Curated annotation (Swiss-Prot), chain A:
Keywords: Acetylation, Cell membrane, Cytoplasm, Lyase, Membrane, Pyridoxal phosphate, Schiff base. This is Pyridoxal 5'-phosphate synthase subunit PDX1.3. It is found in: Cytoplasm; Cell membrane; Membrane. The gene is PDX13. It comes from Arabidopsis thaliana. Belongs to the PdxS/SNZ family. The active site is at residue 76.
From Swiss-Prot, chains B, C:
This is Pyridoxal 5'-phosphate synthase-like subunit PDX1.2. The protein has no function in the formation of pyridoxal 5'-phosphate. It comes from Arabidopsis thaliana (Mouse-ear cress). Keywords: Acetylation, Cytoplasm, Pyridoxal phosphate. It holds the Pfam family SOR_SNZ. Belongs to the PdxS/SNZ family. Transmembrane segments: none annotated. It is found in: Cytoplasm.
């Protein structure tokens, strides 16, 4: 059943997930080629700027969305808040994001995502942190990045961190992986498994600081399966959104990138 | 002992929420929504035991047990509350400490006391002084954040598990380390539980928060609901939540169109 | 190599000023005053490569070569600029870094890149990645102060002099210390120069500033003139200044009744 | 085949293992109830023992013969596997030849034992490929069991903590002790180290030996010869491990042994 | 290149053991046991060996003869080249004559070996003109192979990191190990350090010598009991570093090590 949740997330490759806080928006996201939406109650820029405790979103607003778009719907559940998760599985969302963008609810432990028949997406900033979330049940990893700044510098750090040590791992002396696992503080099986496969045995995405087409495409060029975006804090949400989507599906095509970035308006 | 009788009184709260009120209006609402008790409170500035005319008014406006807080170590304040004949006293680190070296000698009262804690020794030490009930202090302030609360419930429950399965020979050294009375440690081991009702408190703000504490293994929660948009609605939900914690479809409905939390 | 061809393209800028513009109006002014190029810029907040519609508009409004900046390590941004067919890309630490561990692999582009530097190893490291031109970073910000710029030009030129006259046996250890590729070090020694066009930038604000950089031995300057009172006038003067740097009587006239600098 | 080596090592439960440096010593040890012997010819650099010596011992006794390799010195272990030892001890008592990596024990047919100071360490030697764990104490010939008791208690105690821990909290527990998560769940469900667990270091008397056993170990190592009459001392310790919960047995066993070390 | 040529000269030593001698007698012993070459020495301040010595040893044997110069002692090297040794070891085992600069080995015709503790150090020696790299272990006669192993590992390890590394990230990699980027890029392609790579430092037993070989080395250096026997054993060990059966018979009764 893990194999299957993993599988369920394969459908997302080459995808651009978008954060939303209402139907109008979610409608805008699909209406622009957003492979999935991730409903909330505040976008991360506003979370940083407006403070307060950020928690799961109210069912209502999660339902009013899931009933306005055909594409998968995700929702955030405070790290460690297994009961917020529950309430989400019940309500019938496609994916749950145990999101460090929301107010950490347990400093010592993450939700046990296995005890769920619904697939989880966890944040990460490096290989270990990713191999640990996967062991807890996460089916689909993403990068922590930097949430609510419009600066993409941290996603880059992270993406590179992980791909980096992965490549280090791929060609490591077989007798040296043990030690590598200790220093990574990660489960030896999952390591050897990432070694064999040369990548993260689950769908990997970029998140945090993606603000222009060039950003999204850099992630893809760096080696990501897709990107997250939090788009509505810009000037014309549609154009930009369609552009970012177009960007991920033509990431290796400069000529098109130039086209899709043309007069998109003021970013964040 | 008269201690068991008190421990016994606090058991009839198991499976309930305890709401914090500062008027009569607020108490008449909490009881309506199904609170199994209301704790009377004043509300920077120095915070003390609330006025007796107010503790008197609530006690009257509701049929549920009435609790009131006393400053830590303020045994005279506690004598007054007892005199007023309220059902429980909470020696509450939420208001202004009055003795930073000593808590009330709770064995000198007829009233069952509650004390807050952040870990197991704190709880066993409060108990040994005569607390007949414990609550994991958590994040004081009106922070609406359960983290510290979860941290503190986790520390406790977990510390008790370690204790439960411990080699008897090591329990001495364990008692020394958490700074708790050995025999109350040995007790807690025998029963694999803290010998008193154990509630969660601090930062509970959503049906979900409340049900999480219960699933962590608590006997109920405190909520401090009137800094919300629909206090009756939200309060009902939290009661329902605590009452049906293992029921996600129920938890889902309670959380629906709830209005703004804090 | 295709590298010499690029190095070659940047040589036709020798003896010029490169002005920073953010509109079409500003570009049509810089070219009028005799700028041998204009670099297109956005302008706290995060600073990125400017909009292509704007890089397109300038490219059209002027007959002088067009430069644009890309964030450090933002190779996709650079791919876009190349695609737009601008003449030069400046991997610019002036806007928001995008990769703090790696710069663009500039050998993967047809475009000649510029990179900033504060010392010799920084410049040789940028070159080895494929910079075809160097500029002494200086005081970023719009500080109007050349000090850091002079500091950085001085460090460079001087470091090269030390290198020039060095015992060949010691150049290895020298290469290690400034953290630069030995063979590009050995090159720089052979030619007693940095194998690429070397401009000054940062804090240039007066004809005099501009002529000082030139006298220090640079190949030209960047100026970032529109936060002044008469940008055309001042800009003319700086061009004249750079063009006639060793002529004090000329420098004097250019500086006359100039209006307020920044 | 790992379960095969794990299974093999089990035939040591109940035993005392004696460090010998000659045939004359390996014999005394067998002829006193040693359930196995561990060969070495012993500051300076201490290495694998001489293959000749090992053959003499192996021939001079029927009990399983064990030998020492330096940590991370696989080849020394290839050699030992070649001469056909029944067990190889990748032992820190001997000059470490790799400070960053241990022998990849799953590349060998022979069963490996390793040392540990805590649960995490044992679980790491095991994932590497040890089929048996010994809890060390003093690496120096000190005759003091203190550190040994520390490490046996530490080991047992974490296993007990883990034995009853909320499933949701094992992950973080596996992080904090830097152990492979699944060997930690295996260890939880079993309530014990998935391999044979011997005490080692400082054991000098019947009481010492019998204390480790009462503490939960499956047997003990001893290094006896540091004494007045090693034959009597050795039988004593064996008997001690054999009858560990019987105080009258232990009193008799300890009576007039001569001086220890 | 004249460097390529030098790199070729050391490649004859591939697969051998290099015994460290300080007499004619030792050099003979060493030669019979099958030492691919011998490195001359004397044993305070340790210097280039005495040219009478290096001449008696050259005549006494038929295998390549090496000798040690002090780090940065370019003259000492000029001398060795003149009396026609086959290889020069600019060796940190004898006293350092220049703390900041190494011999500019390119200015020589005789091929140089240099020590190293990691990849940055090795490449740096190579740029200066080392044609061969030897790991460094314990500089003393500690008969302990530990540091040696650490340094073969670090080297083998970062090369493997290097081979697979994103090309854009190699510049920064070059900087962090203070290495000439263009040798780092060569090394990456070759998935190897472009010269012979001998372990040295604390090889005391056949097992040790063989371990070094199984870790990827091209050969080893080696510094009472029964020298000829032990020497034969270590040579045998490097020649059959995969035959645990031969490693076994080889090591049997080699008498006491150091």
């Amino acid at each position: 059943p893990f194999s299957v949740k993993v599988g369920l997330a394969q459908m997302l490759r080459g995808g651009v997930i978008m954060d939303v806080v209402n139907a109008e928006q979610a409608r805008i996201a699909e209406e622009a080629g957003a492979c999935a939406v991730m409903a909330l109650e505040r976008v991360p820029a506003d979370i940083r700027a407006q403070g307060g405790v950020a928690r799961m979103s109210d069912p209502q607003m999660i339902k009013e969305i899931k009933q306005a778009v055909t594409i998968p719907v995700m929702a955030a559940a405070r790290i460690g808040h297994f009961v917020e998760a529950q309430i989400l599985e019940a309500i019938g969302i496609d994916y749950i994001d145990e999101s460090e963008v929301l107010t950490l609810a347990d400093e010592d432990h993450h939700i046990n995502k296995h005890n769920f028949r619904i697939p989880f997406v966890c944040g990460c900033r490096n290989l270990g942190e990713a191999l640990r979330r996967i062991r807890e049940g996460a089916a689909m990893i993403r990068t922590k990045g930097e949430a609510g700044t419009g600066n993409i510098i941290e996603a880059v750090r992270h993406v590179r961190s992980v791909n980096g040590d992965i490549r280090v791992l791929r060609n490591m002396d077989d007798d040296e992986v043990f030690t590598f696992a200790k220093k990574l503080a990660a489960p030896y099986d999952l390591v050897m498994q990432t070694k064999q496969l040369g990548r993260l045995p689950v769908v990997q995405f970029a998140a945090g600081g993606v603000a222009t087409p060039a950003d999204a495409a850099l992630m893809m060029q760096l080696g990501c399966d897709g990107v997250f975006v939090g788009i509505f804090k810009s000037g014309d949400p549609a154009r930009r959104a369609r552009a970012i989507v177009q960007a991920v599906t033509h990431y290796s095509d400069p000529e098109m990138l130039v086209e899709v970035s043309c007069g998109l308006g003021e970013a964040m | 002992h008269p201690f068991s009788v008190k421990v016994g009184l606090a058991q009839v709260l198991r499976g309930g929420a305890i709401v914090e009120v500062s008027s009569v209006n607020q108490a008449k609402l909490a009881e309506s929504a199904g609170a199994c008790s209301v704790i009377v409170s004043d509300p920077g500035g120095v915070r003390r035991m609330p006025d007796p005319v107010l503790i008197k008014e609530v006690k009257r406006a509701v049929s549920v047990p009435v609790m009131a807080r006393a400053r830590v170590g303020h045994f005279v304040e506690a004598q007054i509350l007892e005199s007023l004949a309220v059902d429980y006293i909470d020696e509450s680190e939420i208001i202004s400490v009055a003795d930073d070296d000593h808590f009330i000698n709770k064995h000198n009262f007829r009233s069952p006391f509650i004390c807050g804690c952040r870990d197991t020794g704190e709880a066993l030490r409060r108990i040994r002084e005569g607390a007949a009930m414990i609550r994991i202090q958590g994040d004081l302030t009106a922070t609406g954040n359960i983290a510290e609360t979860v941290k503190n419930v986790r520390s406790l429950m977990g510390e008790v598990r370690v204790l439960n399965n411990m080699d008897d020979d090591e329990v001495f050294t364990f008692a020394k380390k958490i700074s708790a009375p050995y025999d109350l440690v040995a007790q807690t081991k025998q029963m694999g539980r803290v010998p008193v009702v154990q509630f969660a408190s601090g930062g509970i703000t959503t049906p979900a928060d409340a049900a999480l504490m219960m699933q962590l293994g608590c006997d109920g929660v405190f909520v401090g609901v009137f800094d919300g948009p629909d206090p009756f609605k939200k309060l009902r939900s939290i009661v329902q939540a605590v009452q049906h914690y293992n029921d996600p479809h129920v938890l889902a409905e309670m959380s629906s169109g709830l209005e703004n939390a804090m």
